[PDB]
Amino acid sequence: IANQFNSAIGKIQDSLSSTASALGKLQDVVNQNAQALNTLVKQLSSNFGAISSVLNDILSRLDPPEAEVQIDRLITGRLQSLQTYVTQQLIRAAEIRASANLAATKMSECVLGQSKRVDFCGKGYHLMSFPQSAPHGVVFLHVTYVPAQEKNFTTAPAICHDGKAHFPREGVFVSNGTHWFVTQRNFYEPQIITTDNTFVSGNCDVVIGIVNNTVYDPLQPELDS
Amino acid sequence: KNKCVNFNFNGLTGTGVLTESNKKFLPFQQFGRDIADTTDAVRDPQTLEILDITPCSFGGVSVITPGTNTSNQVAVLYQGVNCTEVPVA
């Protein structure tokens, strides 16, 4: 686990260094603001129906009663430009505030503690995460537990020994073709079937697919010794 | 130069700071403008040289005050204004 983890962190440095587009999510916020600011400014050069876009010009062109007619067109149009800008900023602000609440939620479940949610901290079973500062944002490196290799085994829902169905207390029953072993779902660790690893409920005539085997009782050799 | 003034060059009117510029213009080149289509530089008609145009400093004024039940002492904050530009007030 020391090599897998350290080797994983190395790939993060190579990916972020080689691939500059992984941060495009943040670059969009910069581009959207640049277009809004650039556009908002360029609207000053527009006539908006007026003879010219320069205020001192119209005041230095039309007479006082005639100028006000044209000046109103610039004020009217330029006014709508601000409304369009403010309207978009309020809407875009909702998308950022929604992301901020999401980032604050992840740090609580992912970073601070351990999250049991499915794929909330990223694919696989979440362990812990590393918060990292990013411009106008934040980066989360999530360490997860991903199973790799598996092997097909024979299983049975229950074991029958003395006539009472035996069920696993934890894990599942597996067999290599000879003896039935107890093992966890996430890894293969053969364990002998014992009364401590199984529970007694019902009989053998109910469970469907129950099989017969020898349940080892650790108390037998103790009583004989 | 180096001051806020109202400049009129061959009919080009505007208010801003005028300074010497290392920016080069072509012989036919006189009135330039920025991405905003606002003139950022001009050539003096009589004596030929390039002048950099910057808008005179501006910004908001924020008042830092405690509660009225506390005291009337207030502190003024000048947004984006250098200390040397305050006396203009």
Binding site: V30, S133 | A36
Partner: peptide, 22 residues
């Protein structure tokens, strides 16, 4: 990852250093 018409840019309440110290 990386005007003259009266558009002002407010500085952030917290510097890039403070967010790094969190």
């Amino acid at each position: 990852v990386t005007k003259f018409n009266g558009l002002t840019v407010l500085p952030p309440l917290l510097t890039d250093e403070m967010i790094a110290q969190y």
